[PDB]
RNA sequence: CGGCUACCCACCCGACCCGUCUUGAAACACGGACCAAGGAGUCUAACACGUGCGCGAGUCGGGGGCUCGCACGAAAGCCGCCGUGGCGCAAUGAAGGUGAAGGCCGGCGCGCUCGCCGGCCGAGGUGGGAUCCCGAGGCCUCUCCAGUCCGCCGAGGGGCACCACCGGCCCGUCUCGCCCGCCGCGCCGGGGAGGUGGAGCACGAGCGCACGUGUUAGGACCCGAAAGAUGGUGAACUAUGCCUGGGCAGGGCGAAGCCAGAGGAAACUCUGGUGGAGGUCCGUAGCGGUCCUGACGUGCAAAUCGGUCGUCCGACCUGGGUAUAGGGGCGAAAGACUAAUCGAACCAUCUAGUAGCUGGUUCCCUCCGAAGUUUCCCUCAGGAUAGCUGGCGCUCUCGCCCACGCAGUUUUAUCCGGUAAAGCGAAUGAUUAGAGGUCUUGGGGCCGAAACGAUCUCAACCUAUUCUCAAACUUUAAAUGGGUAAGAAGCCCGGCUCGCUGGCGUGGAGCCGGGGUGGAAUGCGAGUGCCUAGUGGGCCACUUUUGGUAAGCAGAACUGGCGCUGCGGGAUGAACCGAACGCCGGGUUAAGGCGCCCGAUGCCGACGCUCAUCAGACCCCAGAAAAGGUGUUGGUUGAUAUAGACAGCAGGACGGUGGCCAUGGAAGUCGGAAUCCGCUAAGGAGUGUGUAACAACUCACCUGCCGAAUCAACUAGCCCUGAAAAUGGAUGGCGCUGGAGCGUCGGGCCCAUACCCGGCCGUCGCCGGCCUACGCCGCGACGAGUAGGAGGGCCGCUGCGGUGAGCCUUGAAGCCUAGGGCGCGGGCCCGGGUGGAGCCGCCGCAGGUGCAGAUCUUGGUGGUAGUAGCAAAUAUUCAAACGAGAACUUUGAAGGCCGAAGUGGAGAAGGGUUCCAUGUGAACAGCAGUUGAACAUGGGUCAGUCGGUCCUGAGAGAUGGGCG
RNA sequence: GUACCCAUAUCCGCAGCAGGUCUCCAAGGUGAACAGCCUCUGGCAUGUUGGAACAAUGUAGGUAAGGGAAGUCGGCAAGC
RNA sequence: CUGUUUAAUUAAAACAAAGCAUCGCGAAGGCCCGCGGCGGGUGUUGACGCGAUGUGAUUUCUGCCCAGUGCUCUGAAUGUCAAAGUGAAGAAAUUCAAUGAAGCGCGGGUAAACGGCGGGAGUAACUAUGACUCUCUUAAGGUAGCCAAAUGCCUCGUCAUCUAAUUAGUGACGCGCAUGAAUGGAUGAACGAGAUUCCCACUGUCCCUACCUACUAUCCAGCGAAACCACAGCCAAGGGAACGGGCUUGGCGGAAUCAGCGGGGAAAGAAGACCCUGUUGAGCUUGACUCUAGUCUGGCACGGUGAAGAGACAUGAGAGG
RNA sequence: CUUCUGACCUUUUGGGUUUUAAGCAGGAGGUGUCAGAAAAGUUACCACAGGGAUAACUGGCUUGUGGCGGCCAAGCGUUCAUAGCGACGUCGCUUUUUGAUCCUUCGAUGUCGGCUCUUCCUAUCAUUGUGAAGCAGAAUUCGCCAAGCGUUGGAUUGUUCACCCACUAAUAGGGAACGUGAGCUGGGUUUAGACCGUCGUGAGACAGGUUAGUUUUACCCUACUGAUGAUGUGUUGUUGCCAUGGUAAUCCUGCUCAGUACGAGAGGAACCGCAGGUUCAGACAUUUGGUGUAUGUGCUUGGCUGAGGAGCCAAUGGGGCGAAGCUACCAUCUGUGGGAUUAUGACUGAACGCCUCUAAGUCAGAAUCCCGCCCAGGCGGAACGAUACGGCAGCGCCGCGG
RNA sequence: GUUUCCGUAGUGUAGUGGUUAUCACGUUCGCCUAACACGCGAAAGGUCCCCGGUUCGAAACCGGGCGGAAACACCA
């Protein structure tokens, strides 16, 4: 009662009957599995930019303005 | 006259018998004699998904109650201070428990990696994102002017759903630190900053009903077992006890005991009788069954018969009563017997036990359409998961010098490898041979007391070489291939934040604002979510390969095919070569072919090869080698020849020298080493035959005649030998030789479901119209398919509610039909013939809803087939009679059988009217009857003294008692 | 209770089935014999069919010149 | 030996049998039945009896091993040993310690209990075979007997006889794969429907077949089924699931039949009794796993009275290292 | 599940304290069949659902192995390679052995050997025709055409195989599903009983040995043997042809040849001719031998008809003879010739001045082949006879018209 | 063919839990006897089958050959 035991024929078909994907479409990249400290930085880093960016953008962009 | 058609026949071509296990079925694989009816995915509960409806942060009366008693009312209507309750609106923790809002501005404490006060906004931000909004601009028959008018857009903006990322909040744990409150200042509570686990929040979408799919548990698509348990029934067969009865023809051998005679002193012995002993012998009835492995062997018989058999006074056979009853009995022991069943009886129930295992699974059309693979499992005939597949959608994109994106593809750049090859005078491992050098030791020879005092050779060593290799060697290193980039998500500029980092405003990340899109070729409209069947036994071929001698063997890689697939060639074929399939007409072609089957060369086809007494004839493919040929055809390398060759005919073919090694011989001729001269026209210390040797013959070489082309060795095309197998046989056969063989080709010719054009059906896509909108058109490309999945059915059956002023005894359902027709098909309508009372159409609803199979169930009928068979036991014959009817009934007569252990006369068990008479002969008796045990009617069994009844036998049994 | 069968036709075996089932009576001859054979008392139609012919093969029975087990696994069967 | 047995494939060399043995039991008992009781069988019985086995008449023998597995006897001298009881710690559950019934271990007996019985080397004035000898070795090393056996792979062992010829038979030899002593060994008169060899007579068993008779088979009168059947039946080759009847190419092919025969229809009879799979079973067997009837023990109640003696715990007094 | 560790952790259920128990987080006590059940053997007394997914037969691919050949030739062959042999190497055929695979067969294809019977092959044992030898003759060996005909009787074993005796020309090799079991036999293999030896404690096992062990059916179709038949010539009969199918003859001994050829001998043929014989085939019964139921005749046993006579019964009572007919290699007779040719040997004669059997042509040539002879004669045809009274009839030939 | 075991002075054998050449017989010398047996005192004889690996160190543990020895080879 021997049988076959393994082959990969008739498996690149299989594979191609539904056309092989690439991701193909990670705009702004997830960013798990950067490092702790790098996140330390870039946490604070944000929450500061929302507090503490508006008067000195805000006479820059009017300056620019003025400029151009 | 016309007519397709479920009528019949003929002709040309094609055509193996359906269904399923299988990689493969017409199979010498299995089921099917035929026909009619029945016959297999249902129902409940639960879950998940999709769809439809109602209400909607709610939803639901299924539990009850209320109405007047109603056939439909076991319906329906209502409750609402009947919302108890289920699900959802809140999650996280094992639990104590805790439990989803933040942002902006001003002031205050050292705006201090830091809290408070007052006011405002409010479920955050970024990149895409259908749609929507503002609008430069320009366009309408002659001018200034306007309003709606014809009329879009560059650019900008708010951004649905959803996707991707960042940030925030809640719960349990982890690290670091400080602050706040006291119905009481404590191992009391609460709060902050970070990275984690959650099925969370981040404006909720659920509830109820219905339909469809899938899964689970229930008998669960249908049928199927060896088996287990529970409770009862059998000792009429058989096995063994016990009680009570019956039976066993005749002969042979001659034990004990006894008598008589003789011998002996005694012990005792010898002879002749009598006697009838015995798990004794021949043998019958009886009981069993050795052999013919006889007869039968769909029989007389689900174990019998004919001979030949063993035993037959006994451990013998046998009737009746009684006892032992199922994991029990009983066994002179075979696991044999226990009611045709015994290595665990019979009947019923659990039970429709389970089965990963056989067989079967019921109408049509259309569309899409596999796999035999990864991993896991006591897994290997199975299942789970992933892959392949179908269905349901959603988000977008096109139709008006420029979009987004993708690719079994190429190009331009940039990396990767270690196979094919090649090499080892390059490492590792093997391996061959020669040369040169002289350090070392070992073995021989020499000078000679011995002495690395000296010499030659050998052994090993070194150097330069040289031969052959390595899947588990490699300096080098291909082809093929793999990854990446070819932009608006990109490039540059300016500025903030950082608790990361640090000479530095240093570096790096994030955030904000602005600028210009024409960024390799070709083709294509893309992304994404849910549910799920089948699949998990494969095979073949080119190429690369593992084991084996090889396989139509086993196992791998890529691709294609069969399976899942028709069509044209290969005669026939699963895989080969073309080419893939809706129904047809015309033309053309591939693969192949053009002597006839069998469509096409029947061209005044071309070149050359082949004669085969086994010719040859097209990838897989169905046969053949090493070797050989003065059979023919080319080709290469050479050698001769007028200074007359090859063949032929004729002659010469010596001297030294009978050379030398050899003694049995060599005096050219078995044998080993050699090898020169003279005459020369030429002689080889001799090519062969022969002698034991001596001798003769012939050849190398030379010359006489003839006369100009000849010889040798290789090579490859056809053909031949090599080439032997069993029924008669295969280029397909017939045949074919100036081809119908072989190799090279030219022009025509034939066709497939292949291609092009056109007619028709269907699907899909795009689209038209304010004409059943679920209808009507318009254009274009496509149609094959097992398992499987969907859509449609104005296909069909049964029943229910609406509905047709439906149909009819002037003929409904049903059935038949060489009749007419429709639809592609499920099927349907009408006509004609019997029939006599119910039937149909549309719209919804619910099914015990379609049969070709299952050694399918029931019922009926064929071939066999007027066939086998009416043959165990000696046999019947003549006349008459009743009678329609006599091989069989009855009687007369004759001949036979059974022959007293009967084919006779009566009983027990069992049968129940069969006993007897009369009448009939459709029915019974395997033909027949006037006959019977058949049928119908009527009769028949008389007891104190025959038996039961009475008695106990083996045994069965209730009370007292005990157990339960 | 009293009939009848008590069986190759009244029982059992699915049947008018070469199967099975317990008993008493038993004559003459030959013969040791209740052996086998022929008769008498008593029964019967040959056993669920008849007619014609005598082929193969078969089922039972008997022979065969010479050899006598040489056939066959075995003298199996048959015969002395 | 006579007898019995697989009814329906065996009749025996199988079973039984008398004889020879062994073991248990003196009745509150041995072996058994029963769900139950002091209920039953042996038992209306008592070691010349009952119950359980081995071998199988007579004669002659019963070799040697208790190492192993069984069976039995003995002792609280002695290790282990469960419930119950005793003492201590604590508030208690709980824990600890000693005391220790059977069994096992410790010792002995038993093999007419299951069973078992060795392999090398050197050696004799022809050589071989070998009396004899050294060593390893177990519990004992096959003793008396017998033999290519119904037991011997080599094997058709070697010699002799039987025969023209013998793998057969018989007698003998015996390091005998793997004979052997109640697992009985060796003989043996009588008897085998037991197996085998040879001889005389006898015959169709044959050489070598032939003939006759009875019945059937044949035909006719009457009456008449059954198995089986997708269709239906001419072959050769090819291919195919590798042996076709039907496909292809050939050979070819006239209705309807009867009597035979058995080459085929891979003929029929049965869901292969051989082999394999099933996470399908059933008889069995045991040192498989998990239990249990029964049986042997210990404890608690039924279970009570008198005396003697001992062990352990508690109290105070005295010697004591 | 157990155990240990940690929080001055949570719950121990009406509320507190303590013990205990549970939980939380992580280390350990394992599933070696390693993603993990807790597990001995036999069934020949076996059963069930299945499988040709999977062995034991044949058949199919292959040919290692077995067998049979070839190639170059170191040597054997007194000398000498190839008369006959042939190592070291190498190329093929066969399924008559064995092996390899599992392709068909598991709702069955009956498994060995023997008996009987038919056909085929050649890798030829003999016979016919030939060539070559170390072929003097005889006897052998190697080859070719060649399967037409033969290729035994027996002791042993179940045999396939093998050994032995004797005969002969020879006792050659095989195939047909390892031919043949609805043909047989059942000897062992291969059920159930039983014995011996070994293994296993045991049930049981043993390509170790020995015993007794059911062999089912044809009436269907085709094939084959035999027999009615059928179609066409108008019916029918007689006499004939052969298209086709088969085939039958084979072998040996004795006498002359001749104790001659040949050979020194020992030995020792051949061709023609003549008697026969083995096997086979066809007949036949005059004789001989069987058979026997003319139940023909005649004895005799037991019974029966009263006794003699005449008879009968006993499954044809026994046995002595025996007619007709069947039958025996147990009696007797018969079995027959022409052609083309294979192998081979040649003629003429080139290729190639010569040579040559060949290349075109001619000859001899055999158990091979075909025909003759012998059988049945075709969906085959001939020649000839008679062709329908009766009383009406019916039927042929010629030429007719509708 | 498969799986295990053995190989040591002339013979039978012991022996590593790594670091000997072990016991007896056999040969030879001496004493004892008049002389052989026997006894006593002694000596010689080892490639631990062959070749490699581990370790400082092997015959020893392991790998490959050589020559022997046990068990199986079953179902058809
Ligand atoms: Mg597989
Ligand atoms: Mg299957
Ligand atoms: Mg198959
Ligand atoms: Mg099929
Ligand atoms: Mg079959
Ligand atoms: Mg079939
Ligand atoms: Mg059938
Ligand atoms: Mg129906
Ligand atoms: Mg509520
Ligand atoms: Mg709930
Ligand atoms: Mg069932
Ligand atoms: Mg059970
Ligand atoms: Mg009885
Ligand atoms: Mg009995
Ligand atoms: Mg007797
Ligand atoms: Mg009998
Ligand atoms: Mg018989
Ligand atoms: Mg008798
Ligand atoms: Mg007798
Ligand atoms: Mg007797
Ligand atoms: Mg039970
Ligand atoms: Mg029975
Ligand atoms: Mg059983
Ligand atoms: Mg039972
Ligand atoms: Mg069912
Ligand atoms: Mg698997
Ligand atoms: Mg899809
Ligand atoms: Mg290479
Ligand atoms: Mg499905
Ligand atoms: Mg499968
Ligand atoms: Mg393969
Ligand atoms: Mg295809
Ligand atoms: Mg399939
Ligand atoms: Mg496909
Ligand atoms: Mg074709
Ligand atoms: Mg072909
Ligand atoms: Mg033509
Ligand atoms: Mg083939
Ligand atoms: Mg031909
Ligand atoms: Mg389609
Ligand atoms: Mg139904
Ligand atoms: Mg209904
Ligand atoms: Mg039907
Ligand atoms: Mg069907
Ligand atoms: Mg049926
Ligand atoms: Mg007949
Ligand atoms: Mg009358
Ligand atoms: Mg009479
Ligand atoms: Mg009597
Ligand atoms: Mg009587
Ligand atoms: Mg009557
Ligand atoms: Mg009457
Ligand atoms: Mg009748
Ligand atoms: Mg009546
Ligand atoms: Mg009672
Ligand atoms: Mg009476
Ligand atoms: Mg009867
Ligand atoms: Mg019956
Ligand atoms: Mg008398
Ligand atoms: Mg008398
Ligand atoms: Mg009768
Ligand atoms: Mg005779
Ligand atoms: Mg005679
Ligand atoms: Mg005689
Ligand atoms: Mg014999
Ligand atoms: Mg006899
Ligand atoms: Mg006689
Ligand atoms: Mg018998
Ligand atoms: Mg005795
Ligand atoms: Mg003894
Ligand atoms: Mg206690
Ligand atoms: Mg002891
Ligand atoms: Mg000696
Ligand atoms: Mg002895
Ligand atoms: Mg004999
Ligand atoms: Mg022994
Ligand atoms: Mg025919
Ligand atoms: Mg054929
Ligand atoms: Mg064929
Ligand atoms: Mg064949
Ligand atoms: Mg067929
Ligand atoms: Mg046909
Ligand atoms: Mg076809
Ligand atoms: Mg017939
Ligand atoms: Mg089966
Ligand atoms: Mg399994
Ligand atoms: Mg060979
Ligand atoms: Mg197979
Ligand atoms: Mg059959
Ligand atoms: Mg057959
Ligand atoms: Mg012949
Ligand atoms: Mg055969
Ligand atoms: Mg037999
Ligand atoms: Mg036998
Ligand atoms: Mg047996
Ligand atoms: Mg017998
Ligand atoms: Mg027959
Ligand atoms: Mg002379
Ligand atoms: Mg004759
Ligand atoms: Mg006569
Ligand atoms: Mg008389
Ligand atoms: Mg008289
Ligand atoms: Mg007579
Ligand atoms: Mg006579
Ligand atoms: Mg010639």
Do not use: C
């Amino acid at each position: 009662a021997k049988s076959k035991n393994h082959t990969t024929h008739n498996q690149s078909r299989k594979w191609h009957r539904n056309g092989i994907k690439k991701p193909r479409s990670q705009r702004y990249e997830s960013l798990k599995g950067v490092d702790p400290k790098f996140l330390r930085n870039m946490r604070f880093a944000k929450k500061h930019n929302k507090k503490g960016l508006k008067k000195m953008q805000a006479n820059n962009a009017k300056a620019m303005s003025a400029r151009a």
